[PDB]
Amino acid sequence: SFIGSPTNLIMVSSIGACLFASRFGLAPSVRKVAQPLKLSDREVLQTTGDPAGFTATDVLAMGAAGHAIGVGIVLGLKGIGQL
Amino acid sequence: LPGDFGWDPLHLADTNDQDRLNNAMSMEWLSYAEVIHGRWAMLGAVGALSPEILGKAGVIPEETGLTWFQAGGLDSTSNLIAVPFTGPIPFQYWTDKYVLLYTMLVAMGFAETRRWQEYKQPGSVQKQFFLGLEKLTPPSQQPAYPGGAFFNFAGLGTKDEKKMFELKVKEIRNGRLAMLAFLGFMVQAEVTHVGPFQNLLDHIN
Amino acid sequence: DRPLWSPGSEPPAWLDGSLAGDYGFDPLHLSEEPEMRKWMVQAELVHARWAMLGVAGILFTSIAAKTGAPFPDWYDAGKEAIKTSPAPLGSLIFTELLLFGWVETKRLYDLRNPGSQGDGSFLGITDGLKGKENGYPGGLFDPMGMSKNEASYKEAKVKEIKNGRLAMLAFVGFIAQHHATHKSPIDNLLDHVADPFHVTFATNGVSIP
Amino acid sequence: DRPLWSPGSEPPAWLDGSLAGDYGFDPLHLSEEPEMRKWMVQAELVHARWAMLGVAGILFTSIAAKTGAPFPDWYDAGKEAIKTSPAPLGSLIFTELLLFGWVETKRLYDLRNPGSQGDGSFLGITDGLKGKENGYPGGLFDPMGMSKNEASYKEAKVKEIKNGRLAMLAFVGFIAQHHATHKSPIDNLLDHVADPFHVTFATNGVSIP
Amino acid sequence: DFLYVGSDAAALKYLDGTLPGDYGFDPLGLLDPSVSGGKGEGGFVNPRWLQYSEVIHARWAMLGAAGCIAPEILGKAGVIPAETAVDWFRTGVIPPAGVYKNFWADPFTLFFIEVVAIQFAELKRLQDYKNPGSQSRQYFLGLEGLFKGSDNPAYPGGPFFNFANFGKTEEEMKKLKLNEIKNGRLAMLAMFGYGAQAVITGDGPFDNLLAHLADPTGNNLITNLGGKFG
Numbered sequence: 060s061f062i063g064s065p066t067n068l069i070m071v072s073s074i075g076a077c078l079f080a081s082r083f084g085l086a087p088s089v090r091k092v093a094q095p096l097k098l099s100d101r102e103v104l105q106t107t108g109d110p111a112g113f114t115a116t117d118v119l120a121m122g123a124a125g126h127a128i129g130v131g132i133v134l135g136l137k138g139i140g141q142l
Numbered sequence: 143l144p145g146d147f148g149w150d151p152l153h154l155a156d157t158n159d160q161d162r163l164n165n166a167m168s169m170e171w172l173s174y175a176e177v178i179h180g181r182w183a184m185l186g187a188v189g190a191l192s193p194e195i196l197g198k199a200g201v202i203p204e205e206t207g208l209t210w211f212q213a214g215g216l217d218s219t220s221n222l223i224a225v226p227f228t229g230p231i232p233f234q235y236w237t238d239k240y241v242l243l244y245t246m247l248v249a250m251g252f253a254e255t256r257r258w259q260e261y262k263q264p265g266s267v268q269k270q271f272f273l274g275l276e277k278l279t280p281p282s283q284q285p286a287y288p289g290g291a292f293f294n295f296a297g298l299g300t301k302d303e304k305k306m307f308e309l310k311v312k313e314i315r316n317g318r319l320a321m322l323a324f325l326g327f328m329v330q331a332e333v334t335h336v337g338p339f340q341n342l343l344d345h346i347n
Numbered sequence: 348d349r350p351l352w353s354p355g356s357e358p359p360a361w362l363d364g365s366l367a368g369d370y371g372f373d374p375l376h377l378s379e380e381p382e383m384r385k386w387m388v389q390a391e392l393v394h395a396r397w398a399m400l401g402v403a404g405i406l407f408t409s410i411a412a413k414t415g416a417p418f419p420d421w422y423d424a425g426k427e428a429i430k431t432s433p434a435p436l437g438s439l440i441f442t443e444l445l446l447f448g449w450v451e452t453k454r455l456y457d458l459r460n461p462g463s464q465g466d467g468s469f470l471g472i473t474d475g476l477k478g479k480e481n482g483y484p485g486g487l488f489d490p491m492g493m494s495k496n497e498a499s500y501k502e503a504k505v506k507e508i509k510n511g512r513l514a515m516l517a518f519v520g521f522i523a524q525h526h527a528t529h530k531s532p533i534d535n536l537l538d539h540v541a542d543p544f545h546v547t548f549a550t551n552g553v554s555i556p
Numbered sequence: 557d558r559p560l561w562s563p564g565s566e567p568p569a570w571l572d573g574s575l576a577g578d579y580g581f582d583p584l585h586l587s588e589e590p591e592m593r594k595w596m597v598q599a600e601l602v603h604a605r606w607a608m609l610g611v612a613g614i615l616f617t618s619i620a621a622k623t624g625a626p627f628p629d630w631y632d633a634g635k636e637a638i639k640t641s642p643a644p645l646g647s648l649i650f651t652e653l654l655l656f657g658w659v660e661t662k663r664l665y666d667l668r669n670p671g672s673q674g675d676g677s678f679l680g681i682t683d684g685l686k687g688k689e690n691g692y693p694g695g696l697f698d699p700m701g702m703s704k705n706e707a708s709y710k711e712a713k714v715k716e717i718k719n720g721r722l723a724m725l726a727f728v729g730f731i732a733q734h735h736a737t738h739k740s741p742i743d744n745l746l747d748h749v750a751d752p753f754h755v756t757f758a759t760n761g762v763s764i765p
Numbered sequence: 766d767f768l769y770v771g772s773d774a775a776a777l778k779y780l781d782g783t784l785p786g787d788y789g790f791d792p793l794g795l796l797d798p799s800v801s802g803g804k805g806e807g808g809f810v811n812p813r814w815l816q817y818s819e820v821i822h823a824r825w826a827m828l829g830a831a832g833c834i835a836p837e838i839l840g841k842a843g844v845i846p847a848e849t850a851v852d853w854f855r856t857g858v859i860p861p862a863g864v865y866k867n868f869w870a871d872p873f874t875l876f877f878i879e880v881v882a883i884q885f886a887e888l889k890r891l892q893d894y895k896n897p898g899s900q901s902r903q904y905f906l907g908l909e910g911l912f913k914g915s916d917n918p919a920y921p922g923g924p925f926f927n928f929a930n931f932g933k934t935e936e937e938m939k940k941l942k943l944n945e946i947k948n949g950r951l952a953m954l955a956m957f958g959y960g961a962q963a964v965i966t967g968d969g970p971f972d973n974l975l976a977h978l979a980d981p982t983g984n985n986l987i988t989n990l991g992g993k994f995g
């Protein structure tokens with residue numbers, strides 16, 4: 060996880076893609092309950108600052124999912140011999 | 143007040159109570175603290191830019207004029223922290239390194255205790271005994287703006303009201319500009335280890 | 348109506364200016380209870396008197412050592428004395444323990460009930476060993492003093508308590524610059540008066556990182 | 557209205573303070589029934605008296621051993637006593653068992669029916685051998701004592717029960733620090749007085765792993 | 766200003782400017798009055814006992830955070846001798862970490878003294894919590910007058926617990942309450958830190974502060990997690 064490593068780049072890009080995905084619809088966040096196609100835009104608790112629904116549990120889950128996706132990508136690329 | 147631009151993004155001034163003493167968050171206390179913080183900021187800016195210009199121009203004898211942080215002893219690489227009077231100053235003053243700090247602490251403590259006791263109970267701090275220094279500072283209804291025989295000794299604001307408020311607005315805006323300037327000097331001295339006028343000359347050239 | 352420890356501050360209600368050196372300095376609000384006030388003022392008076400005696404003895408010994416009389420430093424003076432004193436350790440400390448415990452309990456039970464020792468139970472004397480005031484005894488402790496006059500008594504009370512507080516400050520200063528310089532206080536005064544701009548508490552090395 | 561075993565606690569309903577040493581300490585609800593309350597009072601009194609008697613004998617023997625007289629330890633005293641005793645083992649325990657059975661069923665049937673033995677059945681005595689209180693007999697067992705006065709009798713009852721409980725604590729302390737130190741209780745006391753800062757229940761190796 | 770990052774809804778509905786804390790940070794929710802409803806003492810999950818344990822944990826954390834770092838800078842300076850100046854976990858609290866041999870008694874002797882004294886203290890505290898002001902009625906060495914307490918068992922006051930007795934006004938008392946709970950919540954993280962720093966470096970917390978100050982990039986979380994002893 061040295062600054063400049065391909066694993067660091069993969070981790071940061073995954074985290075940023077997950078925050079982008081949860082910022083404007085586009086992900087089953089605390090604001091967006093999920094149907095088979097993830098609709099209906101509900102509201103609970105409060106966002107505490109920036110708009111939409113980035114609560115304390117929204118960034119906690121998306122960071123967890125973004126981290127967990129990154130272990131799959133890095134170790135998958137490491138197993139096949141990439142980066 | 144003496145200033146209203148409608149810029150409170152974090153809403154730190156909402157405390158749902160107004161009190162003269164305590165809670166450290168009333169609008170009058172915040173305005174007083176911001177005004178004196180700003181005044182210290184323009185004194186810091188002028189004291190950290192003045193030896194820089196007059197040092198390279200040869201008006202003042204050149205001993206650490208270009209570096210206010212080196213003059214005060216601020217390096218952040220000696221051992222611990224760039225607290226002043228701790229870095230190795232190449233110029234020996236008439237007050238060497240630390241009894242200067244003692245004199246500054248006792249004088250600023252006298253002045254701060256006077257200011258704080260005027261803030262708590264106005265009109266009572268100039269009664270008992272101060273070797274005749276009590277008559278120079280008459281009381282006033284504003285904690286940040288005493289006026290009188292001292293401070294406003296020239297009488298440049300005690301003639302009307304609108305010009306007084308214009309001077310208030312100009313003073314607070316120059317003060318906020320000085321806060322941004324001193325945060326700039328903060329950042330340059332911390333991350334470049336070279337004075338700010340030298341950086342001005344580099345970005346001009 | 349009185350000079351306080353901070354001008355413009357609010358003096359305490361229990362500190363009405365009727366005490367010696369009543370500058371109204373009480374941020375921890377001690378001596379608020381009247382019995383606690385009595386014990387505080389007695390403790391302050393005895394600590395002030397012993398601090399004054401200690402600073403007088405230390406200054407006399409240091410001045411004599413500077414002028415040429417053989418005297419050790421104010422620190423470890425009992426260490427240099429106990430090797431040559433006829434009285435060994437143990438006996439001396441317990442002898443002074445017995446004597447000053449006697450005086451401690453006598454003045455304690457005079458503090459609790461005034462005039463409880465003026466009944467002649469000790470060597471049959473009435474006017475002596477009786478406390479005229481709380482922390483101030485009377486009789487044989489005032490052979491020729493002007494405490495009979497009340498104005499001179501009040502002035503001497505204020506002078507005594509102010510000199511006592513100055514002695515407290517002198518003693519903590521003595522131990523502080525002894526740990527700082529490892530020298531006599533008179534030598535420290537001579538060093539300060541020789542080079543004031545340089546020789547001070549800044550350049551002693553210790554206490555300034 | 558009474559000092560309890562824990563301040564602010566709720567005293568039991570069956571402990572109204574009418575008993576000797578009634579501090580209201582009973583979390584297991586024992587002695588709730590009045591007959592078992594009397595039986596517990598009797599048992600506490602006799603266990604207390606035997607604890608004080610045994611502790612006093614142990615202390616006397618240990619003090620006599622420490623002063624130089626030939627005396628055994630409080631432990632295995634009988635083991636070295638029997639080899640010099642004219643009375644052998646077996647006969648001694650059985651003799652004391654028969655005699656103490658006589659005395660103890662006499663006091664037992666006095667406990668069941670108060671004043672049952674005061675009918676002159678035992679050698680024609682009526683006033684003697686008759687229980688005055690719950691666990692307190694009379695006649696022969698109060699030769700000169702002040703149980704006639706009520707207040708002095710109550711104070712003596714409280715003193716007896718408190719000394720008894722202190723002696724139970726002393727006996728458990730005796731066995732505990734004998735198993736800890738394998739020495740006499742007076743020897744342990746002298747070791748505690750000689751070096752209090754180090755010699756204790758913690759630096760004996762055993763009981764603190 | 767108000768509320769916090771977590772700040773669950775239906776949790777601010779039972780607290781608004783009442784407790785000395787009450788910053789709106791109850792994401793899980795444990796001060797609901799519906800919890801432990803009924804009769805009797807019941808359980809520990811209730812606002813009174815939670816506030817009581819929070820302020821007790823707070824004050825214990827203040828004392829601990831003062832005592833853990835207090836010998837250290839004074840050992841760097843010449844205040845206390847460096848022989849006694851040792852890391853807080855090497856004083857005998859963790860004998861695997863180390864004990865101080867030059868004590869006036871055995872560590873278990875001091876443990877028994879602490880057990881007796883603090884058992885008296887905490888059992889009197891618990892008995893006064895069960896029955897308010899009941900420790901001022903049973904005779905205890907002639908000092909029953911300073912154990913009267915107040916309506917709140919957490920904040921007793923009296924001739925000794927508040928012997929300075931300043932903050933008589935409600936506003937100053939509320940400010941002191943907020944200051945106490947805020948410095949206690951800081952000491953919470955101070956102890957959490959001190960333990961984590963001790964387990965990640967094996968050295969004292971002020972030495973870790975010096976390490977972060979001298980080299981912030983080279984001595985921080987990422988380098989110390991990948992180093993020796995953690």
Ligand code: CLA
Nearest residue numbers: 605612615616688692693694697701702703712713715716
């Ligand atoms: C010291 C503890 C103690 C106390 C305070 C009492 C008090 C009482 N008992 Mg009790 N008793 C005790 C021990 C004690 N007893 C022991 C050990 C036994 C077993 C032998 C008995 C057997 C007994 C019976 C059988 C009866 C009483 C009765 C009484 C009451 C009579 C009042 C009286 O005369 O005062 C008693 C005063 C004392 C005992 C103080 C004397 C203490 C001496 C001086 C100690 C020294 C002797 C010792 C052996 C030496 C120790 C040496 C050591 C240092 C090494 C009263 C409630 C009677 C009662 O309640 O009738 C209504 C009753 O019938 N008691």
Ligand code: CLA
Nearest residue numbers: 829858956957958959960961962963964965990993994995
């Ligand atoms: C789940 C069980 C478990 C546990 C308990 C540990 C625990 C430990 N391992 Mg292990 N480890 C585990 C699983 C586990 N590991 C697994 C699954 C792997 C993967 C293979 C590893 C791989 C691994 C490696 C490779 C290494 C360790 C090391 C360590 C140590 C460093 C801990 C650390 O970094 O935290 C730092 C410490 C803390 C964060 C402290 C926690 C906070 C404290 C408790 C707060 C308490 C403060 C409180 C307020 C006051 C205290 C009370 C006071 C008043 C007395 C520690 C002993 C390292 C080692 O040997 O170092 C010794 C090491 O080299 N482990």
Ligand SMILES: CC(/C=C/C=C(C)/C=C/[C@@]12O[C@]1(C)C[C@@H](O)CC2(C)C)=C\C=C\C=C(C)\C=C\C=C(C)\C=C\[C@@]12O[C@]1(C)C[C@@H](O)CC2(C)C
Nearest residue numbers: 581582583584585586603606607610613630631633724727
């Ligand atoms: C400590 C003790 C009993 C303690 C009981 C406790 C704490 C019980 C607690 C509770 O019940 C309460 C209160 C209330 C309940 O709701 C709850 C519980 C918790 C259940 C008895 C000791 C009792 C101790 C006694 C009776 C001691 C007797 C000693 C004798 C006879 C000595 C004889 C000798 O033989 C030796 C041993 C050796 C020879 O060298 C010398 C001679 C003299 C020959």
